[PDB]
């Protein structure tokens, strides 16, 4: 019972991480494109 709830917390945090992960990838992609507008 207690362990189930602890795993619930882990999975949820995983989901938060994976959202930030795609936001980071998006941001790297954008600042790469801003290097191309330079030329």
């Amino acid at each position: 019972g207690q362990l189930q709830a602890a795993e619930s917390r882990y999975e949820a945090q995983k989901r938060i991480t994976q959202v930030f992960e795609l936001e980071i990838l998006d941001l790297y992609g954008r600042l790469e494109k801003d290097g191309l507008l330079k030329k």
């Binding site: 995983k14 991480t17 992960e21 980071i24 990838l25």
Partner: protein, 268 residues
């Protein structure tokens, strides 16, 4: 060989008596095959119930991958990075002290971890076990031994005096006593000093709860190379020798050091 069988009796318990595994590891050297297992149980990497072991290691595996992956996301490590450096970065992330860039210089504490991580790498082949053992081994130094380690240099003199006062005298003659590589012995626990085959028999004792062993290793180094040291006559010449000692004698040194430790501290 009789020693190995008495351990296997302890290992057959459905619930491992961690108390007994310590007292064994204190008295006797660990068999090569069981070292990783015992270290993991004592360091709390595995619980005492060896039915959970498989299920727990799963969590430790996921944790390893999660963290590692996160470092690749933030461009902190690549395939070009050495494994000891990876373990460092993982450790920094887990303990919340990741710097801003890989280029940023490594502080004294980081280089201690890195030296130990390199030593563990030779002792433990599994990447996940190696990291988790290194982690908990180093964490132990900064918690369980936070107040013990800084007092070892004082004890090193006290116990050297009790085994060979003339050698201690000679060190003090050259004002070499204060400039001994105490950080190599008592922060890095001889990582980079002794070869890993011998060193692990020392770390058997460190894991099992005694850091005082490190002193008697240091003492036995000087006793062993007495003739060589007495020939020198400069704090700089003495220290330079002790930072690059002969690797072939280290098997004996550890064995003698443990006897020396048992003699002065009278383990149960």
């Amino acid at each position: 060989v009789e020693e190995k069988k008495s351990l296997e009796i302890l290992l057959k318990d459905d619930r491992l008596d961690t108390e007994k595994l310590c007292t064994f590891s204190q008295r006797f050297p660990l068999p090569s095959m069981y070292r990783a297992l015992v270290w993991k149980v004592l360091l709390g990497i595995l619980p005492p119930h060896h039915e959970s072991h498989a299920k727990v290691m799963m969590y430790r595996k996921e944790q390893y991958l999660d963290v590692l992956h996160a470092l690749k996301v933030v461009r902190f490590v690549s395939d070009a990075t050495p494994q000891a450096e990876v373990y460092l970065r993982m450790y920094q992330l887990e303990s919340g002290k990741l710097p801003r860039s890989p280029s940023f210089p490594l502080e004294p504490d980081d280089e201690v971890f890195l030296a130990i991580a390199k030593a563990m790498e030779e002792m433990v082949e599994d990447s996940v076990d190696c990291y988790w053992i290194t982690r908990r081994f180093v964490n132990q130094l900064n918690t369980k031994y936070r107040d013990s380690l800084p007092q070892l240099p004082k004890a090193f003199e006290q116990y050297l005096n009790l085994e060979d006062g003339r050698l201690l005298t000679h060190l003090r003659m050259c004002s070499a006593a204060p400039k001994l590589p105490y950080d190599l012995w008592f922060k890095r626990c001889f990582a980079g000093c002794l070869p890993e085959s011998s060193l692990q028999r020392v770390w058997d004792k460190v894991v099992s709860g005694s850091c005082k062993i490190l002193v008697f290793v240091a003492v036995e180094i000087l006793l062993t190379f007495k003739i060589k040291v007495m020939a020198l006559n400069s704090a700089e010449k003495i220290t330079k020798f002790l930072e690059n000692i002969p690797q072939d004698s280290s098997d004996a040194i550890v064995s003698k050091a443990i006897d020396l430790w048992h003699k002065h501290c009278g383990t149960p």
